[PDB]
Each structure stands twice: as structure tokens, then as C-alpha cells.
Specification:
Elements lengths: L25 E6 L2 H6 L2 E6 L2 E6 L9 E5 L10 E7 L4
Parallel strand pairs: 1-5
Antiparallel strand pairs: 2-3, 4-5
Length: about 90
């Protein structure tokens, strides 16, 4: 159950929700451990000083995007955060 750390990519890199207007999207890549890919429980993500434990699906595999609202668009209009799971091919 190795701990993971998110990327928090600035808007671009071939990643854009856009549609929503009031709801600023932000993309972020979680490199996940295969133990957690199997279990599918809460995994503690430490990134940018923020500790957010997300319940990933049992059997979660490469390219699965966990859209968590209120973690992307900060300030006043709550926006979503696109968590792209990144598993090793082996």
C-alpha cells in the first residue's frame, strides 16, 4: 500500500474539461501502486501541502480519471480535479 503524490498539472498537456463555465477544471496525474490498484480503497495523496485521501475503485487501471469536485477550481467557483491513474506496465 505505497503512498502516492499527485502531479497537479497547469491547464494544458493534452487535458482540458472546459465545458462548465462556472466550474474551473484542473488536471492532475496520480502514480498509483499496484497493491492499491488491486484493493481499491482510500489512498492518501500528498501534494502541494494538501493531504487528500481518495477511495479509488477495486481493479482501477491505467487511464481511469477520478473527477473530484472542489479540489480544482479554487477561489470562489468550485471546480473539479481530474485524477488520471498512472500504473506501471509491469
Amino acid at each position: 500500500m505505497s503512498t502516492i503524490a499527485l502531479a497537479l498539472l497547469p491547464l494544458g498537456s493534452g487535458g482540458s474539461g472546459g465545458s462548465g463555465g462556472s466550474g474551473r477544471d484542473l488536471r492532475a496525474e496520480l502514480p498509483l501502486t499496484l497493491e492499491e490498484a488491486f484493493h481499491g480503497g482510500e489512498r492518501v495523496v500528498e501534494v502541494a501541502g494538501r493531504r487528500v485521501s481518495v477511495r479509488i475503485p477495486p481493479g482501477v487501471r491505467e487511464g481511469s480519471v477520478i473527477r473530484v469536485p472542489g479540489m480544482g477550481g479554487q477561489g470562489n467557483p468550485p471546480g473539479d480535479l481530474l485524477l488520471v491513474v498512472r500504473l506501471l506496465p509491469h
